[PDB]
Paper text:
The tail is attached to the neck and made up of a stack of 57 nested hexameric tail protein rings, with an inner ring of the tail tube protein gp56 and an outer ring of the tail sheath protein gp55. Each ring is offset from those above and below such that the extended tail assembly can be described as a six-stranded helix, with a twist of 19°, a rise of 39 Å, and an outer diameter of 230 Å. However, a notable feature is that the tail is considerably longer (225 nm) than those of other phages whose structures have been described. In the extended state (left), the sheath forms extensive interactions between the sheath and the tail tube. The main tail tube protein, gp56, has the conserved fold seen in other Caudoviricetes tail tubes. However, gp56 lacks both the ɑ-loop and the N-loop seen in other myovirus tail tube proteins, as well as the C-terminal loops seen in siphovirus tail tube proteins. The gp55 tail sheath protein is made up of three domains. The tail tube–proximal domain I contains a loop consisting of residues 368–378, which is twice as long in φCD508 than in the sheath domains of pyocins, AFP, and PVC (six residues and three residues, respectively). Domains I and II reside in strong density, but domain III lacks density because of flexibility in the region.
Numbering used by the authors:
A (entry chain h), B (entry chain i), C (entry chain j), D (entry chain e), E (entry chain X), F (entry chain W), ...: 7 to 136
Write the structure that this text describes.
């Protein structure tokens, strides 16, 4: 019903190691189970339990510097804020111990704008606001 | 033949842990066998038997809050009601011990509406109505 | 050459456990070998032999009831009749000991008609008519 | 250069067990190596040798009878003739000991013409003409 | 060369103490030498001679009764018939004084079909047919 | 032939010292001969005779208490019931004087569910039902 | 039935000589019989009796110090606590007079994290809690 | 910059076993490493070394004869010449010990021109011109 | 915000072994972890650590010479410069010990411009400028 | 270098007691030393001398008759010929006084082709051709 | 918890007889008890005591010289240093009187990098640093 | 560090009794101690001393002749040369008094290339070059 509840991608600000990142196209982050399946002798359905949690992120954008190449495989943090405009509420998520799986050293095509895409893993998250 | 028997997606109401969810785009739920294949010496076709049953659900929608991030990996229930309008009949399905496989912490694109997609597993189901 | 030999999907009637199913979109059924490959020392080509036979079916349609959810994983039969109109001939195939691999508990999208898709296995077949 | 050398699909006649098949859409047949790779200590490139040969065919068409369902998994032959019209030359290939991998018992969609698709294996081939 | 000479496991019927066993998965039987090695002073290769013969069988299947638990360690016979279908020939082997080495009292896993596996010894064999 | 004769692991209930055990994954029990081999001077095959009988069991499951650690090396009984559902028949086996070979004091891995596995010996068995 | 009864490896804390060990991957401990087999003249089954008890442990983890190399072959204790979260119950086991069979002086591979694995024996155990 | 440096597919002539092939649509040939990855204890990046070299080719065209069916799995050579027109330079590559992986016995569709596609392996190459 | 920060593919110059490459369509280079996953007994999330680093590049272009065929599998370097025009800044990346995984001997289609595509691995990188 | 020197398994013909065996999958034969180790007082390396020679063979194939069951433990001969096709040379080896260690009375699985595997010993060998 | 405590294999430097070894893949070293088991008349558990200590090492790497073949069976020392990078701490272990059990004279495969693997024994160890 | 130090299997040439062997896949040779363990009354660690040295080799390849069958159990020599290409250095090892443990008379499988594998012992070695 309420039009105002929907949140657009334009209400997004990303901070990589405390400095705002402006030239990003999309971002993803998931906190995934290693779900443990259990089968019992007296019971005829599988029982699922929570396993170890791992974080995975991807982060696609437009290249304007060699920030990620300098950044290397050092650990960093990602603070992601998604705000509402019609309402004043906002969500803020801090991904901790983020680390790149691979360095986007070179990615260019003949007549397109140079884009940068990275992926990696993070240990845990803090839901700062909501 | 009968036009009235068909059921549209618009006749759908979803309850996550007893509170209605309004900003959902699609939902899926399957109760899958671990079917056991049997081959016998005197017989020339495979015999299939029912194994342990597992439930899997997926649930795609539009982000309006951090409900699933707060929800974490705790167990919850999903009550799914699909009603007919031309007829007064309706189906109601309760998925029990539902648990998320991964947390949709961040999912945003440059100029699109922020969407949320989750998947998980459930133990069993109750066919409340039909 | 002969236009009349072709058979359209519209000349199809499906019986699930003896009661006609009217709201189906497509149906598939295959009877597959576990073909055994043989290599011999004196011979330079593989010899293939018939192994155990397994049946697999899929059955896509439009949801009008909770028939398959009630049906569960019980064994049922499928009688498939494909008739000719310009000619009076018809084929009838009976799939025996049919059993669902998974239950289509929930499948709905935002603005589409609710569809139901199931798959399973069957032991053998009877070619009743042809 | 020469327009006449090209061969169209329309110049095709297929014989299944000696009786012509008229309602076929496409046909495939390959005679595949189990190629053996050899690495030697003194040499820096792989040596390839001929292994056992296996035949595989596929055969898609339009359903007009239960020929393949009756045919079951019995061995049969396929004689494939591809003729030239502008020239009088023609090729004829006989696939021997052909055997179906699976039976196309049922394949129908809501408003489409009923099609039949089969696949299988054959032992060897005779290049009757060319 | 001849496809018909090969014998499939599906052409197998097993009789335990004169009553047919239908739920068996595989069977083995060997008649083993206690081969005697001889070394001679004037000769530079070992001479091998036939020693006492012992029979050993194994018999894996699916549990449908407590037949083997009741059977205990009593002596029984196994008649094994392997028939050809394309040809009318068949082999029949009678294992005599068969006796179980161990009783399969309990063998069950969480979500699998209950299987039974036994092993034992037999004195001699009669090649009834061939 | 008969689908109903097969018995699944889900139809299993285990009683350790008269109290039901619910969190078990698999169970095994064998009653093994100390088979005596006999060679005779006039005869050219080995004669096998029944020796002393020993029982061995293994019992794998999921840890929910320190039941087996408290149980120590005291003697206990195991009653194993395997029931049929499609048929009403059932088997019941009582293992007597069961005793653990080793105590599963500690068994845990980094991110897996804590499992418990025990093995032991039993004197004799009673086939209560069948 | 009860989801809460299962215990995950994540609810584990290990104390080596009173100081907590944080970088462990898995732990094992068994208290094994030297079971004595008895055969009697009038009786046709083996009688089993409890022999001397020995403890054996293994302890795999990630190397962060030379703790075990300094520890040498001195006697130490292991206190193992496995707690429940959904329930407040917990088990605590104290292994006494633990002693290493071998010292893990060096264990490293080319591109993997340095792991440490030890095994040893203990005299007895105290089941502190449960 | 220079328009003349580009080479079109039209400047291509292919020789199969010394006789020109005119009805080809595309050709591919690669000489692939079995690259050996090395990880060292003192070093934090992988070292790559050249392994055994294998050649793979594919060759798609239009069917005008049974050349490849007669050719079988015999070894043959492929000489590939790519010429420049605006410049007089040209490249010539000779693939040696070329051998088909599979025979394109039959490939025809309902109303399309009969095409032939083959793949195979070659030992080495000679860069005759450039 | 700033239009000038974006970098187009047209501001790219590539040097293969010190000589400029003009007829390239796109280039890629990544420096990938062999990320090591760690699970601990007391902790409920995976710990990720940096493993050995490997470089992978791909390099697609238009064929104007047999440079890569002559180059073979020898080691070479790639210097990649991406310059800004509105700003005077530029990035320069030197890939070291670059080596081809496969040689693009032949790649041509019927009526298209002859293209060349290569892939390979490199040991490390130097970020010369930025 | 020379492709023609390699010998495939397809160029194999086996004669058991003078009659060709066609349904064999693999064959092995070794002539093994009972090597005598010598240590001397003045010398610091072991001296090895030739002991008595024994032959061992294994012979795996597909069952088409009860040939080996009738053959029993009687002595027989094996003539093994391995021919070259590209060259006209061939090897022929005659194993003498071959005798089975065990009789393959029964070997069948649920849905697989019945295979026969035998092993035994032979006294000596004649290298008839080469 | 602490990411920095983990030690990677890349922080490893090995000295064989005082000269650094760079081309090693993995190393192992254990200092093993000849543990003495004691059983007493009044006591019902085994008593374990420390026996003589023996050292065993293994050392796998890549061959670049005949160092170990020249080294023969002479006694040598191994100094193993494992350093931390995020922290400045390091461990150093000196294995004394190391001696090879066997000489890796030849170890090569068809298309793989030549590797060298050795094993041996050492008398004692000095924990130089930690 | 240095790429050139690594030695590939392709830089290998083997001489059996002075004539080069070209069709070999891998080779092994070890010179093993009969290490003598010493325990002393006043000392708490084992003392290890060099015992008699024995050589063992294995040599796997592809069959192209009956060289090893003719060779029998006669003594022969193996000269193994492993060369560097980027550097001009090379290793040469001469194994003396090599003698086969068993003769590879027959080794063939259904559709694989005939391989030959031998093992044996040698007295001593000469490190000719390095």
């Amino acid at each position: 019903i309420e039009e105002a509840s929907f949140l657009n991608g334009s209400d997004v600000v990303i901070l990589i190691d405390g400095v705002e990142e402006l030239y990003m196209e999309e971002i993803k982050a998931d906190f995934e189970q290693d779900e443990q399946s259990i089968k019992l002798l007296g019971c005829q359905n599988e029982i699922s339990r929570v396993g170890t949690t791992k974080g995975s992120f991807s982060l696609n954008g437009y290249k304007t510097d060699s920030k990620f190449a300098k950044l290397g495989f050092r650990s960093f943090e990602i603070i992601y804020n998604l705000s509402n405009s019609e309402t004043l509420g906002y969500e803020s998520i801090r991904l901790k111990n983020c680390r790149l799986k691979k360095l986007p050293l070179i990615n260019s095509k003949a007549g397109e704008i140079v884009k940068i895409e990275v992926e990696g893993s993070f240990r845990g998250y803090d839901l700062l606001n909501e």
